[PDB]
Amino acid sequence: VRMAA
Amino acid sequence: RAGPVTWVMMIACVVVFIAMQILGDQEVMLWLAWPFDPTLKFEFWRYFTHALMHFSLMHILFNLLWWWYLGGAVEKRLGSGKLIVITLISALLSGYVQQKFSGPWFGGLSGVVFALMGYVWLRGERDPQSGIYLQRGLIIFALIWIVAGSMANGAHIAGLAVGLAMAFVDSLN
Secondary structure, X not given: OEXXX | OOOHHHHHHHHHHHHHHHHHHHHOHHHHHHHHXXXXXXXXXXXXXXXXXXXXXXOOHHXXXXXXXXXXXXHHHHHHHHOHHHHHHHHHHHHHHHHHHHHHHHOOOEEOOHHHHHHHXXXXXXXXXXXXXXXXXXXXXXXXXXXHHHHHOOEOHHHHHHHHHHHHHHHHHHHHO
16 A cells, blocks of 8 residues: 555 | 644544544545445545545654645635645546556545645745745755655656646636
């Protein structure tokens, strides 16, 4: 899962 | 004190984050993430709700920080309606591009944040009259983070694009 940051 | 839209969005993100701690990330992701399956495409909230989800305390803090600073500045100077529209366009489009890059398992307000960073900076360069501006010291660090990018890379760059675009459009009128 990717953190927008 | 920052306006109603700045606060409403901070409370949304805190309420959601707290739910992610109680229910666990995945459970919340299942309902608020970008459609992972075309069948779900009519669950309209998902094109926005991805923005409300954060994954660590630093993730939420760092995002809400920037959002308070920059969101509040747009709301103060340009009104609540302006920040709504920057938020909605940028959340939807940074989401759209982030999905294409790397699929639907992503969240965070930094798409909207990078759009706000883009909007505040360009608008401050071409329309210093608006009463908003970004220090070059911040556009620098902003650029340092980008190149450092588990980051949503499509969100960062799509958001930034959107924020520049809107700032240009608004700086013309």
